[PDB]
Structures are given as C-alpha cells and as structure tokens.
Coordinates of N, CA, C and O and ligand atoms in Angstrom, one line a residue:
X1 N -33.6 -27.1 -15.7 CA -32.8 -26.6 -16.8 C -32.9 -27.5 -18.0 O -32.5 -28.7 -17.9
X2 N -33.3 -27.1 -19.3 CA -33.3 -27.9 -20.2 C -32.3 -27.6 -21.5 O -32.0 -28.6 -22.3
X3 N -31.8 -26.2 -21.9 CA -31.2 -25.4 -22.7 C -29.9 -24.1 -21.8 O -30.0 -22.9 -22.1
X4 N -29.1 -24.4 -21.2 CA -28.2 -23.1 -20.6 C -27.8 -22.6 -21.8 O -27.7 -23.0 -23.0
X5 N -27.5 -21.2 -20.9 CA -27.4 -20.2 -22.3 C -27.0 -19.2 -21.4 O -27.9 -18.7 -20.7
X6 N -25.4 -18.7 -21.4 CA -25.0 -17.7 -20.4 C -25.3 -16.3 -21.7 O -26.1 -15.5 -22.0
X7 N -23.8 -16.8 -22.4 CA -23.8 -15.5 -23.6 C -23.8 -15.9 -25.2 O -23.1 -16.7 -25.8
X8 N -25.0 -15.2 -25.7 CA -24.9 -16.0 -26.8 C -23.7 -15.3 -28.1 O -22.7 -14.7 -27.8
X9 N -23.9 -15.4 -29.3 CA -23.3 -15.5 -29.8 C -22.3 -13.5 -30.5 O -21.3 -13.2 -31.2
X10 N -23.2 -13.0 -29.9 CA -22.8 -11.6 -30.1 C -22.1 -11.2 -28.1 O -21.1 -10.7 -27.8
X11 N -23.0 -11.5 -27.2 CA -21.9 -11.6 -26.1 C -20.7 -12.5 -25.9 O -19.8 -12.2 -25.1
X12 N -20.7 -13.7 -26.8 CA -19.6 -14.3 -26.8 C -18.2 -13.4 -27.4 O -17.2 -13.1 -26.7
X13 N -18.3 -13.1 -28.4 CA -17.2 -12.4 -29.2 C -17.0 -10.9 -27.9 O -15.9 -10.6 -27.3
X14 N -17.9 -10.3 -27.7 CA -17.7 -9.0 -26.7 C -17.0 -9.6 -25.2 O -16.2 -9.0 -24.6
X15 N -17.4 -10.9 -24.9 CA -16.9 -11.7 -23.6 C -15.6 -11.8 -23.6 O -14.8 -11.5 -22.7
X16 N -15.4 -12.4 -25.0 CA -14.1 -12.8 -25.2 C -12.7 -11.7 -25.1 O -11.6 -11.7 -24.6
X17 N -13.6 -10.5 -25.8 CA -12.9 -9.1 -26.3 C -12.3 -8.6 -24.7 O -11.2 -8.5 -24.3
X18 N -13.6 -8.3 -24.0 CA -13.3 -7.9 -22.7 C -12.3 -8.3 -21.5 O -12.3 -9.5 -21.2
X19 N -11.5 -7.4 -20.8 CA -10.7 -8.7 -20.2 C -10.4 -8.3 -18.4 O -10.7 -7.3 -17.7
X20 N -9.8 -9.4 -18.1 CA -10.1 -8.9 -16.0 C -9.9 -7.8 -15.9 O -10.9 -7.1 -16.0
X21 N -9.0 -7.2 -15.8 CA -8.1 -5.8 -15.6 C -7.6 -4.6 -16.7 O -7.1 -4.7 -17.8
X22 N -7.9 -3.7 -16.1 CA -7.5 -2.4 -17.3 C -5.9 -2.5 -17.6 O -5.5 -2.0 -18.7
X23 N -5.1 -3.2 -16.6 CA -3.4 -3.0 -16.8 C -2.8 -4.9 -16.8 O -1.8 -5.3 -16.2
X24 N -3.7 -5.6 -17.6 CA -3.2 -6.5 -17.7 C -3.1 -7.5 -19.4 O -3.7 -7.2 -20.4
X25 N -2.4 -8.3 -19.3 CA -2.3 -8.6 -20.8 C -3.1 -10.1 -21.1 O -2.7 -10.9 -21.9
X26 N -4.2 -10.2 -20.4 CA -5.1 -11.5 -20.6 C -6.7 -10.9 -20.7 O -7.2 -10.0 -19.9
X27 N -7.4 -11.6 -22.0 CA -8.8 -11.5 -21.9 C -9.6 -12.2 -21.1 O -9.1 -13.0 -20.3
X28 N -11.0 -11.8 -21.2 CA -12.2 -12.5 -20.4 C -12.3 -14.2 -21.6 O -12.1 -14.3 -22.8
X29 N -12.5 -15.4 -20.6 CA -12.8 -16.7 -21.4 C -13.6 -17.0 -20.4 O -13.8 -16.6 -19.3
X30 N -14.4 -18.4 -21.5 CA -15.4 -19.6 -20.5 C -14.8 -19.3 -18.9 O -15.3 -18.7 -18.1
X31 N -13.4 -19.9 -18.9 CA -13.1 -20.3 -18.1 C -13.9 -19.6 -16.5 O -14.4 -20.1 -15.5
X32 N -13.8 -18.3 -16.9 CA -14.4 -17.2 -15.8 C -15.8 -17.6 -15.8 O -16.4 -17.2 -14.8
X33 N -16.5 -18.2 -16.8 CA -18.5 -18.2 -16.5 C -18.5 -19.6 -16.0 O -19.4 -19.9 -15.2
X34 N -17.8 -20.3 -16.3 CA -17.9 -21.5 -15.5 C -17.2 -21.9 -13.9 O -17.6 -22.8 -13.2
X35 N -16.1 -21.2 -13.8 CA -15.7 -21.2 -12.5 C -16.7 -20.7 -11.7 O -17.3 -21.4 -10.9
X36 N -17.1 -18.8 -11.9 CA -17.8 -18.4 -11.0 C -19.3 -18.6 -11.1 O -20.2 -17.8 -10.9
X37 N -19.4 -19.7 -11.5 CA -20.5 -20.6 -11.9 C -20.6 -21.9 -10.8 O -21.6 -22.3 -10.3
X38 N -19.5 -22.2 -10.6 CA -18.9 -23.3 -9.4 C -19.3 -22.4 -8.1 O -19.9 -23.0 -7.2
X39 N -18.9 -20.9 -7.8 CA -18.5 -20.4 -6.3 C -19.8 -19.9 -6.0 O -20.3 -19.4 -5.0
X40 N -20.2 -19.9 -7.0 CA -22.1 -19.1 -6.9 C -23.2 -20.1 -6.2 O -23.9 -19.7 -5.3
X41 N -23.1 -21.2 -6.7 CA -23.8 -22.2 -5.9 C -23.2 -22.2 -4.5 O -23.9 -22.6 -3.5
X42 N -22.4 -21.9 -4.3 CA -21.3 -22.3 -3.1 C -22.4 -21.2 -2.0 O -22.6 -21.6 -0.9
X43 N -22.8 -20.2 -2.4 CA -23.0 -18.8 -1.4 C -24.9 -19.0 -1.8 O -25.7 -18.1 -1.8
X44 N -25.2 -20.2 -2.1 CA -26.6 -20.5 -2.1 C -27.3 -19.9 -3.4 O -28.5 -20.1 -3.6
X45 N -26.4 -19.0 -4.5 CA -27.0 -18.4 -5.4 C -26.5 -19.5 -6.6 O -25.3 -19.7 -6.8
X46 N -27.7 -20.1 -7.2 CA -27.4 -20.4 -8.8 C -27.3 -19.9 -9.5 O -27.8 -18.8 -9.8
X47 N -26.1 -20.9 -10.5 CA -25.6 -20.6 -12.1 C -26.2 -19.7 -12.7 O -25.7 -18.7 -13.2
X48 N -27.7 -20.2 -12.7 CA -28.6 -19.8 -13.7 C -29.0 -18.5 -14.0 O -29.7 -18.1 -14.9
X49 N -28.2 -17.6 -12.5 CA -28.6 -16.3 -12.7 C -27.4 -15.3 -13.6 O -27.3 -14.1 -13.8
X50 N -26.7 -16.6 -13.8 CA -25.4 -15.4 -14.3 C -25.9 -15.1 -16.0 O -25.2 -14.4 -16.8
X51 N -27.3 -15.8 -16.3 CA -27.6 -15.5 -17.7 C -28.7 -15.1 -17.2 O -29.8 -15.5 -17.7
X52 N -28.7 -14.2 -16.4 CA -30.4 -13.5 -16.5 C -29.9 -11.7 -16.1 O -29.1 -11.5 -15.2
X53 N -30.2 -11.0 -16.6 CA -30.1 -9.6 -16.3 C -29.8 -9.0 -14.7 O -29.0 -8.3 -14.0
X54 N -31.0 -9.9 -14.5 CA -31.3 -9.4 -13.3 C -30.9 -9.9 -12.5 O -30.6 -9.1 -11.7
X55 N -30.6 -11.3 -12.3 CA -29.5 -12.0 -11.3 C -28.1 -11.3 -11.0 O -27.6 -11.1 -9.9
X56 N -27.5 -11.1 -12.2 CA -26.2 -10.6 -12.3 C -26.1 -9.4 -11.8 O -25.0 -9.0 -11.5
X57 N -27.4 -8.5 -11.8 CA -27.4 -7.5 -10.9 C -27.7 -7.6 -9.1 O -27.5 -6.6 -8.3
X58 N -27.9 -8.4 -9.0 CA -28.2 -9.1 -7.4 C -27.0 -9.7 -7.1 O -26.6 -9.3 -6.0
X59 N -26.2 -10.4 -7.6 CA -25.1 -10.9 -7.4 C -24.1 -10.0 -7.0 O -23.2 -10.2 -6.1
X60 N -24.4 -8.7 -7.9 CA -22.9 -7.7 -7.5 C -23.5 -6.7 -6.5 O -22.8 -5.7 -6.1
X61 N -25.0 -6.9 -6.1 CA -25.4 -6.4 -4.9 C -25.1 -6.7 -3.2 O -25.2 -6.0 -2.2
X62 N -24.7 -8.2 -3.3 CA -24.2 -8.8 -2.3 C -23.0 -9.0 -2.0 O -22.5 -9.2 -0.9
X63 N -22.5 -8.9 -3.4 CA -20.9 -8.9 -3.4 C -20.1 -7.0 -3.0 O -19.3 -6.7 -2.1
X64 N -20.8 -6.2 -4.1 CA -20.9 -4.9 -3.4 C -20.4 -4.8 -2.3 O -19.2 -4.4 -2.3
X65 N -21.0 -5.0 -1.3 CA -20.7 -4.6 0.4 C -19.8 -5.4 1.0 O -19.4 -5.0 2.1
X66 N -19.4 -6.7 0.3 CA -18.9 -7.7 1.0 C -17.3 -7.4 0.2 O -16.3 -8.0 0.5
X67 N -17.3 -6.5 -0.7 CA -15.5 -6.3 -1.5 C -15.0 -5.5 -0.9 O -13.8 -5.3 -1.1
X68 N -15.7 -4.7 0.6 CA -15.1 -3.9 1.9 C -14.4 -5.6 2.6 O -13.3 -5.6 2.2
X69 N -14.6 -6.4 3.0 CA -14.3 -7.8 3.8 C -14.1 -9.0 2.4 O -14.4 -10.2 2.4
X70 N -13.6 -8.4 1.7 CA -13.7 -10.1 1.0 C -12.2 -10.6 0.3 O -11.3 -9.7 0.3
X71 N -12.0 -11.5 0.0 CA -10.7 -12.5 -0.5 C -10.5 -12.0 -1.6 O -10.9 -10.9 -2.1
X72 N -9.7 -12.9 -2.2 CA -9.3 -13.5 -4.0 C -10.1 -13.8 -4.4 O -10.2 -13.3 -5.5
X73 N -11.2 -14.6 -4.0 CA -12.3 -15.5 -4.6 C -13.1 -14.1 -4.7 O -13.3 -13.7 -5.8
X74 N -13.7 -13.5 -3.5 CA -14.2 -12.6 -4.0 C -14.3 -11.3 -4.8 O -15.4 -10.7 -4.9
X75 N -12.8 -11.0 -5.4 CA -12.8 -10.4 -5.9 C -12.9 -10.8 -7.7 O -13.4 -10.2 -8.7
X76 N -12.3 -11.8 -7.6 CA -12.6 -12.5 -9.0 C -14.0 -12.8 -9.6 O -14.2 -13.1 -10.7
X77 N -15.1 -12.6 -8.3 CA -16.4 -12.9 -8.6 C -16.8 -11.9 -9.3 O -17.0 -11.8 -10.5
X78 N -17.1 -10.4 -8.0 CA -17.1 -8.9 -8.3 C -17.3 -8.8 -9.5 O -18.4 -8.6 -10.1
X79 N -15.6 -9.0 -10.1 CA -15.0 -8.9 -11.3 C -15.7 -9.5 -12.5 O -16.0 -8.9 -13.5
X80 N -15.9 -10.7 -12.4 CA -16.8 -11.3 -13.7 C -17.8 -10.9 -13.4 O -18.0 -9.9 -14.0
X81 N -19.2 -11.2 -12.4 CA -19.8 -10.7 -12.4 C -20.5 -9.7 -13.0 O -21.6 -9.8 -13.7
X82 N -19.9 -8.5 -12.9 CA -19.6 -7.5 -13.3 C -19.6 -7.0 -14.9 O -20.4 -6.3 -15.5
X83 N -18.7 -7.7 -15.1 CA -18.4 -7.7 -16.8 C -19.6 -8.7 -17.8 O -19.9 -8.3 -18.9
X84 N -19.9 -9.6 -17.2 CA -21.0 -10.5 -17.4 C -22.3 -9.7 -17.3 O -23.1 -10.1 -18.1
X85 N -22.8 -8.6 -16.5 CA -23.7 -8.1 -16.3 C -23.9 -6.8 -17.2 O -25.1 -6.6 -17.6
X86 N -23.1 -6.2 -17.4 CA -22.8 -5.2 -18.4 C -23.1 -5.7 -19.6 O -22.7 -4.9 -20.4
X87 N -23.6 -6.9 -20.1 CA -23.3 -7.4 -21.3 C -24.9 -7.7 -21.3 O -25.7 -7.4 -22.2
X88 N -25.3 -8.2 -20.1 CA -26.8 -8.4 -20.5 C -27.8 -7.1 -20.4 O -29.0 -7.0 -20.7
X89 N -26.7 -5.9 -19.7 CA -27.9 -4.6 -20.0 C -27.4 -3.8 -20.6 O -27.3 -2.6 -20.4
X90 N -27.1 -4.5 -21.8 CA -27.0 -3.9 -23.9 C -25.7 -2.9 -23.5 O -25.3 -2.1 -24.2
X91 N -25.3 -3.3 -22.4 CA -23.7 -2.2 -22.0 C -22.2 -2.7 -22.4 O -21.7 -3.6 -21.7
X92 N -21.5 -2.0 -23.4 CA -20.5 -2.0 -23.6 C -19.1 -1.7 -23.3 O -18.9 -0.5 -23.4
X93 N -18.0 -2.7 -22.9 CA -17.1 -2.2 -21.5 C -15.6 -2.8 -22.5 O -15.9 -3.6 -23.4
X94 N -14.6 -2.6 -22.4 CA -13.2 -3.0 -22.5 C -12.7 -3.7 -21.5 O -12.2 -4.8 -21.9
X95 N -12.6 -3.5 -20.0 CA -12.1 -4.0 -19.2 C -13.1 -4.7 -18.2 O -14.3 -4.9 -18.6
X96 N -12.6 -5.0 -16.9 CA -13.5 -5.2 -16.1 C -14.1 -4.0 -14.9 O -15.2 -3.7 -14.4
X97 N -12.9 -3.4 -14.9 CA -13.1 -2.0 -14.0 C -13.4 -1.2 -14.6 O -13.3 -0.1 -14.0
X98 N -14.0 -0.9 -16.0 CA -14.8 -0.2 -17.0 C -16.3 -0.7 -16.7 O -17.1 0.3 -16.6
X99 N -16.9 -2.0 -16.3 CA -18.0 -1.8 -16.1 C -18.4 -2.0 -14.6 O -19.6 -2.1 -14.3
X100 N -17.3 -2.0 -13.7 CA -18.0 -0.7 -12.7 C -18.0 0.7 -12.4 O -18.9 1.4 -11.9
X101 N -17.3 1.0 -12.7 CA -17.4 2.3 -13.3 C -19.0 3.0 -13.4 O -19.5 3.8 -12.6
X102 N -19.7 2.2 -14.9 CA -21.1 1.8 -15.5 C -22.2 1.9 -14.5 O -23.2 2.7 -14.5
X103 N -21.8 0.9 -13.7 CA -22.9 0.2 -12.5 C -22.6 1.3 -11.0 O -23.4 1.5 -10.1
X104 N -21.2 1.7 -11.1 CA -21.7 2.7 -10.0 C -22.1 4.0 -10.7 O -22.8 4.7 -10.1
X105 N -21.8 4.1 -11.6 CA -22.4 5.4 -12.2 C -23.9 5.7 -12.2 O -24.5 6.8 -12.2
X106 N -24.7 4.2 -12.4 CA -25.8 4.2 -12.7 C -26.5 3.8 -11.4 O -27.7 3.6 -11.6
X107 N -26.1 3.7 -10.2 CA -26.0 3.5 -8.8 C -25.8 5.0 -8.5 O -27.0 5.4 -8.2
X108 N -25.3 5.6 -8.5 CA -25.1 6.7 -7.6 C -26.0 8.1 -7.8 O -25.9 9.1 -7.1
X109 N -27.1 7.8 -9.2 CA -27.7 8.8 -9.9 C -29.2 8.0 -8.5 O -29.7 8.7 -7.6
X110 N -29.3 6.7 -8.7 CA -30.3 6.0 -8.1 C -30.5 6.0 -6.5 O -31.5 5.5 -5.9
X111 N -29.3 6.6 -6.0 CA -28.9 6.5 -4.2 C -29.8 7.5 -3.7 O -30.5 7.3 -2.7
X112 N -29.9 8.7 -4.4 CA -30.9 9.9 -3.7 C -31.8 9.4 -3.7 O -32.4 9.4 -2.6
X113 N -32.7 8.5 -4.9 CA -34.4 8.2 -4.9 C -34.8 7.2 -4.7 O -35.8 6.6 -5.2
X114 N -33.7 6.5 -3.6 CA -33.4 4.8 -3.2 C -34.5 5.3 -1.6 O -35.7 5.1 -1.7
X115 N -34.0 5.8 -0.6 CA -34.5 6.7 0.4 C -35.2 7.3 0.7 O -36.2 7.0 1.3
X116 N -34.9 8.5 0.4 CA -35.9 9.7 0.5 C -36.2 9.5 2.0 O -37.0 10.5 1.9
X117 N -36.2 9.2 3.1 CA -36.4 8.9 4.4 C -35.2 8.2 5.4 O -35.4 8.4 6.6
X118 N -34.4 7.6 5.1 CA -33.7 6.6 6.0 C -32.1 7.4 5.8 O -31.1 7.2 6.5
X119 N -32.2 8.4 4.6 CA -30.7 9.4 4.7 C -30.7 10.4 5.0 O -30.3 11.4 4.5
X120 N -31.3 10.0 6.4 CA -30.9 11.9 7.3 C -30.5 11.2 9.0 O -30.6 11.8 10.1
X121 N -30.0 9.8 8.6 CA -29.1 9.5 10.3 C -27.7 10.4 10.9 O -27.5 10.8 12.0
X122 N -27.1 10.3 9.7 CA -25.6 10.9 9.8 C -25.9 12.7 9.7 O -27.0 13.2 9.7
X123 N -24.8 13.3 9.6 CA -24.8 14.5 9.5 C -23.4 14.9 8.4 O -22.2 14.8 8.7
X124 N -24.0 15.5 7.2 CA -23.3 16.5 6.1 C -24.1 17.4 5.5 O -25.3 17.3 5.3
X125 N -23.6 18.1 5.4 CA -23.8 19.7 4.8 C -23.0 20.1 3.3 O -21.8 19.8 3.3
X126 N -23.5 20.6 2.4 CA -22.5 21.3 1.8 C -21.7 22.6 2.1 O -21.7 23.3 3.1
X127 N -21.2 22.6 1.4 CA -19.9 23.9 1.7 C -20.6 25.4 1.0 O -21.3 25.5 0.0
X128 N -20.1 26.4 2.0 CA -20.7 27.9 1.3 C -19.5 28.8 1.7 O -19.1 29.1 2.9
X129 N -19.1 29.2 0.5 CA -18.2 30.1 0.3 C -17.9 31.5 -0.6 O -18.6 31.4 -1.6
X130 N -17.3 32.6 -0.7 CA -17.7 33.9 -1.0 C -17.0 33.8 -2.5 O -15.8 33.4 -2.6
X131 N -17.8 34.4 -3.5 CA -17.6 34.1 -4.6 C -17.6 33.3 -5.1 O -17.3 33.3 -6.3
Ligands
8SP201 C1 -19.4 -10.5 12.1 C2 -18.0 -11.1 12.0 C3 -17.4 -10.8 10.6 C4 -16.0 -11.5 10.4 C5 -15.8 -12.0 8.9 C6 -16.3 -13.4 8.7 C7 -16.4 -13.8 7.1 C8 -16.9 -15.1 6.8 O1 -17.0 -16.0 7.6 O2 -17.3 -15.3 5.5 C9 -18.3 -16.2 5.0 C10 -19.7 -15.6 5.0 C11 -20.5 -16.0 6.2 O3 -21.5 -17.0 5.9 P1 -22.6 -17.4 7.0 O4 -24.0 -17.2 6.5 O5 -22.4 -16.4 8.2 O6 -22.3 -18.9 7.4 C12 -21.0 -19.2 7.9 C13 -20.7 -20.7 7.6 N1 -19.5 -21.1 8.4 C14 -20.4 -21.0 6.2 O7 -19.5 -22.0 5.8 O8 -21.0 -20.4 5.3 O9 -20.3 -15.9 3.8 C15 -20.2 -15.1 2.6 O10 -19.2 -15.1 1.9 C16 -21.4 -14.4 2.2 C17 -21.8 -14.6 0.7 C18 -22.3 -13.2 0.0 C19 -23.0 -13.4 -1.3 C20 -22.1 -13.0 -2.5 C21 -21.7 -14.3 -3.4 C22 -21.9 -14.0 -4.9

C-alpha cells in the first residue's frame, strides 16, 4: 500500500449524507470505514477491499448468508459494507437499508441465470387459478 483511498471526494460528501438506519437520527462517518476496516482483517479479508468495487461486493457475499447466524458486529458490517458498496457502483442510497434493497434487487434479477441446473432440488410450482 503506498496511497489508501476508500472514498474520494464526491463519495465523501454522499458517505457523509448517507446514514445507518432509515428510522434513526445519525449519519454515515470515517468512524464506520475505519472500524469495519479493523473487523475485516479480523475474518482474513483486507481493508483494501472496502475501496475496490469488487471487494465490497464479496464482503456482503459472505456476510449475506452469515446475517441468518450473526451478532452486532455483524450486523454493523452488512450495514456499512453495504452503503460503502453502493457508492463504488455509481449507486445512490439515503439510508443503509436503501442500498440493500439495490443489491438485492440486482441479486434476485441475477438468481435465475446464476444456475440454470442446481435449482431443481426442492420442489415449487406456481399457482393456476380460474379467471
Ligand atoms: C456449525 C456450527 C455453527 C454454530 C455457530 C458458530 C459461529 C462462530 O463460531 O462464528 C465464527 C466463524 C467461524 O470461523 P472458523 O473458520 O470456523 O474458525 C473458528 C475459530 N475459533 C475462530 O476464532 O475464527 O467465523 C466467521 O464469523 C466467518 C466470517 C465470514 C466472513 C464475513 C466477514 C466480512
């Protein structure tokens, strides 16, 4: 590392704007890129990915499945994560639960052509009804 560079100076002002919760009265600060900057190393994943697009999309892929089993800590990650990631794919959010919203929306278009083979274990049908 010779230059870090999470958000620069137009995601800074949108970072700041943005805040944890849709029903709460505090914005997004440093404070949140550098904490979950500390817990990311902790789970074997570096800092360095919370300024890359693509990292921050990997990070809420692991966390994803783990917010069924996870703490405070992990929910706080999710959470920035999340908002941090929306910012590096030119996406614009208010809250934090605004950009998943985003990411599952753009997730669940992607789930049918994720497969094509491995989603016919379980069993559903749609519904048929008269009129
Ligand atoms: C099967 C039993 C389930 C019961 C619940 C048990 C829940 C639990 O133990 O949680 C910790 C879990 C396990 O780590 P592991 O590889 O097994 O090594 C264990 C070793 N003791 C240690 O100190 O790590 O780690 C993650 O959070 C994954 C990070 C996900 C990445 C997201 C971070 C951004």
């Amino acid at each position: 590392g010779a230059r870090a560079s999470v958000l620069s100076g137009g995601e800074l002002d949108k970072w700041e704007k943005i805040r944890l919760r849709p029903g709460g009265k505090k914005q997004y600060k440093l404070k949140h890129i550098v904490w979950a900057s500390r817990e990311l190393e902790r789970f074997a994943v570096n800092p360095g990915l919370l300024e890359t697009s693509e990292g921050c999309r990997q990070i809420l892929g692991q966390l994803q499945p783990s917010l069924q089993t996870g703490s405070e800590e992990l929910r706080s990650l999710y959470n920035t994560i999340a908002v941090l990631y929306c910012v590096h794919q030119r996406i614009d959010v208010k809250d934090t639960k605004e950009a998943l919203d985003k990411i599952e929306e753009e997730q669940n278009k992607s789930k049918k052509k994720a497969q094509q083979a491995a989603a016919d274990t379980g069993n559903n049908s749609q519904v048929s009804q008269n009129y």
